[PDB]
Symmetry: C2
Subunit: 198 residues, 2 copies
């Protein structure tokens, strides 16, 4: 069965960029619910033995009778599993992907500007992503717990823009949350996701 992964740092470690109370609820409540409901959906079926990456990549072929529960809770589980590892108290803006960003956009600042614009323009619940699409870097957003993996695009950076991810600290000010995010991006994890990209 699927398990709630521990955070790789304390609940306070991303302060003041993300508040401890949000990290605790977002992990212990929101992610845990996705794991509970994912397990209920796949329990005693062949899906129970697969990686969450494989299930979401192959979501469009999951049996119709559970496909929605797997979309929501499988997506939820994968997206938050990625997110916790893509955050760090020791962010360093360097490495393979930062170098590739600088060459494609001209500066990290120009990339951050486009990412912030795409992330702010996601209407309702969802995620902003940096993806590898056919060997090119592309910024896309997805609704609810959808993941670009499902459409053959490998996510290497994600930002949760569900209001639960930012409302306690930022309320309506999603752009201020996006600004604070840059301070805690784990570019080592971004590089790892980019290198593993098929």
């Amino acid at each position: 069965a699927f398990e709630l992964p521990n955070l790789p740092y304390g609940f306070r470690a991303l302060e003041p960029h993300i508040d401890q109370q949000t990290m605790e609820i977002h992990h212990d409540k929101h992610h845990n619910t996705y794991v509970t409901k994912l397990n209920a959906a796949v329990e005693g079926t062949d899906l129970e033995s697969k990686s969450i990456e494989e299930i979401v990549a192959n979501l469009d072929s999951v049996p119709e009778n559970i496909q929605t529960a797997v979309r929501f809770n499988g997506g939820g589980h994968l997206n938050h599993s990625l997110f916790w590892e893509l955050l760090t108290p020791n962010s360093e803006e360097k490495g393979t992907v930062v170098d590739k960003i600088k060459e494609q956009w001209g500066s990290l600042d120009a990339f951050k500007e486009e990412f912030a614009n795409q992330a702010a323009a996601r209407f309702g619940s969802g995620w902003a992503w940096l993806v590898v699409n056919d060997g090119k870097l592309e910024i896309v957003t997805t609704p609810n717990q959808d993941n670009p993996l499902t459409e053959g695009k490998t996510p290497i950076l994600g930002l949760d823009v569900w209001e639960h991810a930012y409302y306690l600290k930022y309320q309506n000010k999603r752009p201020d949350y996006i600004s604070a995010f840059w301070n805690v991006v784990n570019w080592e994890k971004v590089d790892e996701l980019y290198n593993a990209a098929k």
Copy 2:
């Protein structure tokens, strides 16, 4: 043409069921944004001089270049316009629709249970509605700022289940918010919307 309606009560009037900070941001920031963006979408079109009820009811007829902008911001304006008028510090569980609820569900409690299940189960951003469909009462939910008007079903009660509507006070506990909602329902406005229902 379109204007941010003033609340029928002070920001503090719905305490302790809905916190004053939420009432203030939700109206002054979230609703105001929908009005700004709506005005920008319809500036120099026939829509300028239509009611928002007519625009949303006939969404499928809006020019396609601006239809999504009108779905989002037109929806946002109508939904929040209804919501403010459907809340009150003087909630009385009686009248035309309460009687019709008791007759159809057997009890207000039975009706609340269906509304609570539908409202809690709506995944991502959206609204839970009591509507008139072919003269009968139905509970439905919509995503984002979609409104049942567009589907020819008349909304007479709505609950905002976007996380911005409840996160500051209730965080993940959407059911506790839904439960607190009953204390501030304006059943007089519910009756008025029902009586108008065409």
